[PDB]
Amino acid sequence: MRIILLGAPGAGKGTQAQFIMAKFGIPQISTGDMLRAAIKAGTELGKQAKSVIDAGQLVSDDIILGLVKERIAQDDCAKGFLLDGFPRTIPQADGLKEVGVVVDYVIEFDVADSVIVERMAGRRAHLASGRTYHNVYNPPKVEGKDDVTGEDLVIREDDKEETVLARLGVYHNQTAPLIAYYGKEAEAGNTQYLKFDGTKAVAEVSAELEKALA
Numbered sequence: 001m002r003i004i005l006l007g008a009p010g011a012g013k014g015t016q017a018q019f020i021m022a023k024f025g026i027p028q029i030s031t032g033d034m035l036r037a038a039i040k041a042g043t044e045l046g047k048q049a050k051s052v053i054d055a056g057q058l059v060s061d062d063i064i065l066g067l068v069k070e071r072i073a074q075d076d077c078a079k080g081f082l083l084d085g086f087p088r089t090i091p092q093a094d095g096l097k098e099v100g101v102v103v104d105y106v107i108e109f110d111v112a113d114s115v116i117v118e119r120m121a122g123r124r125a126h127l128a129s130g131r132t133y134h135n136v137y138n139p140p141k142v143e144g145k146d147d148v149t150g151e152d153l154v155i156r157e158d159d160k161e162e163t164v165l166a167r168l169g170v171y172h173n174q175t176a177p178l179i180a181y182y183g184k185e186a187e188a189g190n191t192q193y194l195k196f197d198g199t200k201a202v203a204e205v206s207a208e209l210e211k212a213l214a
């Protein structure tokens, strides 16, 4: 089972990825989490990516495609995977198509900018796993701490008000065309395309996903 999640930053992709991961027993491949891992390790890649991420801009397609290539070649990805925040640009999608990576579902979570701007304010994240929470819409069971590991949650630097506006502009320019791109792939019979109203409550979005998959 191979799945791509599309939608604005903050649309709820990582949240629904958790549900999907547990339903299909596939690993999540999140380029954002891989980059944050490199930052934590203090690599040259990490140092360079940190300023790009903090500016709300996209990391180079070439660096991204190589991280993803290495990742999906691992054994845990042999029976499938969920791509989360990848692809992010048309060249990334082409890079994936060119190496013949075929996917089963492309799932779009459609959420307006005004809703995203609202949401980012209460996002809290567990950096090591990429699990995210919302202090209003989806809180941790224990405030300030990850439900799984007990480790501290953080406010993301790129979740700042002004950076969020930057990211939404980057999204509408560079990443939204993936909706067309995969709509076309689905029209060619290369994948199934699903679109959901991502402004519904978390449990409501998950319930619709459950009904639509299988």
Ligand SMILES: Nc1ncnc2c1ncn2[C@@H]1O[C@H](COP(=O)(O)OP(=O)(O)O)[C@@H](O)[C@H]1O
Pocket: 007, 008, 009, 010, 011, 012, 013, 014, 015, 016, 119, 120, 122, 123, 124, 132, 133, 134, 135, 137, 138, 198, 199, 200, 201, 202, 203, 205
């Ligand atoms: N359906 C939803 N309604 C309200 N808030 C949500 C919903 N889905 C996720 N959230 C919250 O909104 C923020 C963004 O969700 P997240 O899954 O991290 O977005 P993405 O992975 O698309 O960037 C998080 O704080 C998350 O807890």
Ligand SMILES: Nc1ncnc2c1ncn2[C@@H]1O[C@H](COP(=O)(O)O)[C@@H](O)[C@H]1O
Pocket: 009, 030, 031, 032, 033, 035, 052, 053, 054, 056, 057, 058, 059, 060, 061, 064, 084, 085, 086, 087, 088, 089, 092, 158, 167
């Ligand atoms: N596929 C990608 N292509 C380019 N940059 C990315 C990609 N995934 C993550 N990033 C960078 O990491 C940041 C956080 O991504 P995310 O965790 O997916 O919201 C983005 O705003 C980009 O700066």
